[PDB]
From Swiss-Prot, chain A:
Note: Present with 32800 molecules/cell in log phase SD medium.
Domain comment (free text): Has 2 AAA ATPase type nucleotide-binding domains (NBDs) per monomer, a low-affinity, high-turnover site (NBD1) and a high-affinity site (NBD2) with a 300-fold slower rate of hydrolysis. There is allosteric regulation between the 2 sites. ATP binding to NBD1 triggers binding of polypeptides and stimulates ATP hydrolysis at NBD2. Nucleotide binding to NBD2 is crucial for oligomerization.
Lineage start: Eukaryota, Fungi, Dikarya, Ascomycota, Saccharomycotina
Ranges of residues in domain Clp R: 1-143
Subunit note: Homohexamer, forming a ring with a central pore. The hexamer is stabilized by high protein concentrations and by ADP or ATP. Oligomerization influences ATP hydrolysis activity at NBD2. Interacts with YDJ1. Interacts (via C-terminal DDLD tetrapeptide) with CNS1, CPR7 and STI1 (via TPR repeats); under respiratory growth conditions.
Name of this chain's protein: Heat shock protein 104
Induction entry: By heat stress dependent on the heat shock transcription factor HSF1 and the general stress transcription factors MSN2 and MSN4. Expressed at a higher level in respiring cells than in fermenting cells. Expressed in stationary phase cells and spores (at protein level).
Similarity annotation: Belongs to the ClpA/ClpB family.
Region (Repeat 2): 83-143
Function: Required, in concert with Hsp40 (YDJ1) and Hsp70 (SSA1) and small Hsps (HSP26), for the dissociation, resolubilization and refolding of aggregates of damaged proteins after heat or other environmental stresses. Extracts proteins from aggregates by unfolding and threading them in an ATP-dependent process through the axial channel of the protein hexamer, after which they can be refolded by components of the Hsp70/Hsp40 chaperone system. Substrate binding is ATP-dependent, and release of bound polypeptide is triggered by ATP hydrolysis.
Full-protein residues shown: 6 to 148 of 908
Length: 143, 80
């Protein structure tokens, strides 16, 4: 169903929520997966669909880090309660994307897309359009 | 018009104004385009007329970026 890369990004969303002591998984945690590493080679962080597309990766980095700080510290036992409908939908949308893209496996780009398509900055501190075409262009030119 | 080098960079500035949802193309974006990349061949930024002129290219980059972040937004269609 998924590529190893897609599984890595999703898995990181889940484990980052555990490491940050966060309850229900939110779009924020998948975004946390995107900015999980300083490696530029990680498309979700520097050689990004954002950075080479329309917006400063830092804009997005701070959206997420602000949100990760904002979500209160939980008992480790609930730290990653469930993907709920929120991540369920992102993963299902990634599958809808496979169908549209005629891709045999879910790509990390489908997760980037699906998350971005659903997501919006939750606070006034940062703003950015979900520039769907820019993120698709950059995804299509890689790998 | 502009040379192929200048056209590339100006094209970038125009791109950046639309990427950033900004209502106008302005020196902030043109300068941003003239930051380009970390390649030393970037005459606008690294082996430029400023650093070899004893002024800090990182400084100018960072100020432009502060400006890009603070410029008012438009829902992309009104950009430029």
């Amino acid at each position: 169903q998924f590529t190893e890369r897609a599984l890595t990004i999703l898995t990181l969303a889940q484990k980052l929520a555990s490491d940050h002591q966060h309850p229900q998984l939110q779009p924020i945690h998948i975004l946390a997966a995107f900015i999980e590493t300083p490696e530029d080679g990680s498309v979700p962080y520097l050689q990004n669909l954002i950075e080479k597309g329309r917006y400063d990766y830092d804009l997005f980095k701070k959206v997420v880090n602000r949100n990760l700080v904002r979500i209160p510290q939980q008992q480790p036992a609930p730290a990653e309660i469930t993907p709920s409908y929120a991540l369920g939908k992102v993963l299902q949308d990634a599958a809808k994307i496979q169908k549209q893209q005629k891709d045999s496996f879910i790509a990390q780009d489908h997760i980037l897309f699906a998350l971005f398509n659903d997501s919006s900055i939750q606070q006034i501190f940062k703003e950015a359009q979900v520039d769907i075409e820019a993120i698709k262009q950059q995804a299509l030119e890689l790998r």
